[PDB]
């Protein structure tokens, strides 16, 4: 049953919140299921912030080791990424929003917070870790979602991560693959300092039976938009910003070879590869358009 997940069982949620199985295991929550609606709304909000960080709250529920995000909404706050618990400034607004949402049949409560990292990847900074640690101390069960709208566009793939922090003093176990992301030099220090203080959840998405139907019928006309994307100039300034960074990274990797951190050149090579590969994919779409609409004649 595709729509079974949309059923809200209040007593079952109260029972889970009274049981608190997450207190028995700091790796209890392993999966993050996000509705297509919440994904779209968070990505749309994230893009609307442009190069500035925005944030919001996520409404949802828990089911075993899985955290479920049903909806989201933006918070009118300043200092996302600079202020610890910046969300706190919107407390009043959050209370009213939810109250008004309950009046129209939104039954799910706060399950987490989302914020954007435009052009610098999905991870938790020091400020983010303090914020999420506060949230897990006083508002548990809570999850932190991070989205990079800029990299979503440049890579043609959704750039989203879901994270949970470890309590102060607690050490993670042996296994940590850590899927690699290019982090700019102005953020890499803080990234490295806090990268072992949290873990990443396995993210998956879902939609309803009606969403399924409507998206197939939308596609019957929305295909036109895929052959008219123009991705190379929409967010050009990003690739030029990344090249700048890449240049300074290469300066540091040259300084490493000078006389005498673990092989900076290989990292820089993977960064230059990623940026170039994205650029060539852009050109691939442009050439495809040229082959389909220009090389036809009378």
């Amino acid at each position: 049953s595709i729509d079974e997940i949309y059923k809200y069982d209040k007593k079952q949620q109260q029972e889970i919140l009274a049981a608190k199985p997450w207190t028995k295991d700091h790796h209890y929550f392993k999966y993050c299921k996000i509705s297509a609606l919440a994904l779209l709304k968070m990505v749309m909000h994230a893009r609307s912030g442009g190069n500035l960080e925005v944030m919001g709250l996520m409404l949802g529920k828990v089911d075993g080791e899985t955290m479920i995000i049903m909806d989201s909404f933006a918070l009118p706050v300043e200092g996302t990424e600079t202020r610890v618990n910046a969300q706190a400034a919107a407390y009043e607004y959050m209370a009213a929003y939810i109250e008004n949402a309950k009046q129209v049949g939104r039954l799910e409560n706060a399950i987490g917070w989302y914020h954007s990292h435009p052009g610098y990847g999905c991870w938790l900074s020091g400020i983010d870790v303090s914020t999420q640690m506060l949230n897990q101390q006083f508002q548990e069960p809570f999850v932190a979602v991070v989205i990079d709208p800029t990299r979503t566009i440049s890579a043609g793939k959704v750039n989203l991560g879901a994270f949970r922090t470890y309590p102060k003093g607690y050490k993670p176990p042996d296994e940590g693959p850590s899927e690699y992301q290019t982090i700019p030099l102005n953020k890499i220090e803080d990234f490295g300092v806090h990268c072992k203080q949290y873990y990443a959840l396995e993210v998956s998405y879902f939609k309803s039976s009606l969403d399924r139907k409507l998206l197939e019928l939308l596609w019957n006309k929305y295909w036109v938009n895929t052959l008219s994307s123009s991705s190379l100039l929409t967010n050009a300034d990003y690739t030029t910003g990344q090249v700048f960074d890449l240049s300074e990274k290469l300066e540091q990797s040259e300084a490493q070879l000078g006389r005498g951190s673990e092989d900076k050149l290989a990292k820089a090579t993977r960064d230059s590869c990623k940026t170039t590969i994205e650029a060539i994919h852009g050109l691939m779409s442009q050439v495809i358009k040229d082959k389909l609409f220009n090389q036809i004649n009378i």
Binding site: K291, L292, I296, N297, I298
Partner: protein, 208 residues
């Protein structure tokens, strides 16, 4: 056109020789009516061909297939037209030019529409865009008309095949692009796996 099609077809099925001959002068001197395909294919108007009102049928043939220069070449035979009808036929000639090429120089337009100064031509192109016949923009400095969209006028039962001749030329085009991707994607895997395999050989020599 759309409303005028039904509105004048209703009158076309209930009209005779002279009334149809004057109705031709009424449909050509009416704003919005730039296609005469349904009206020219009527048996009632077919009777007028090779009859007492033959020049009017020839005039309808010029308005549905020919250009303003074709009218000027046969103006002695064709019935006289007012400024509104001459304009309309000029609009349709610009549509034929726009059907040929996207960027039309002013010289070709001035010669084809038989105009003397630039503003007359510019005002006619404005009248075209305002009557939803053409879409585009005018470039003064390079003396060129940039056409964004032009409507369909000629029906052409015999030359219909040409449309398909281009449609197939597009289809084949797609069929190349599609296959191209299918191949390139395959290659992108063909490399990857190979490289992985090669790496797994290098990594097997670490034990020795």
């Amino acid at each position: 056109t759309g409303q005028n099609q039904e509105q004048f077809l209703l009158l076309a099925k209930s009209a005779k020789g002279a009334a149809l001959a004057t109705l031709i002068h009424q449909v050509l001197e009416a704003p919005g009516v730039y296609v005469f395909g349904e009206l020219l294919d009527m048996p009632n108007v077919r009777e007028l061909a090779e009859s007492d009102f033959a020049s009017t049928f020839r005039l309808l043939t010029v308005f549905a297939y020919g250009t303003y220069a074709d009218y000027l070449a046969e103006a002695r035979n064709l019935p006289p037209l007012t400024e509104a009808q001459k304009n309309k036929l000029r609009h349709l000639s610009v549509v034929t030019l726009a059907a040929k090429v996207k960027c039309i120089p002013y010289a070709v337009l001035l010669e084809a529409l038989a105009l003397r100064n630039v503003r007359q031509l510019e005002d006619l192109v404005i009248e075209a865009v305002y009557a939803d016949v053409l879409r585009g923009s005018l470039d003064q400095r390079n003396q060129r008309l940039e056409v964004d969209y032009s409507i369909g006028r000629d029906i052409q039962r015999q030359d219909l095949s040409a449309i398909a001749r281009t449609l197939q030329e597009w289809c084949v085009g797609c069929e190349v692009v599609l296959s191209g991707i299918e191949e390139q994607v395959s290659r992108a895997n063909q490399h990857k796996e190979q490289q992985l395999g090669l790496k797994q050989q290098i990594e097997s020599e670490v034990a020795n």
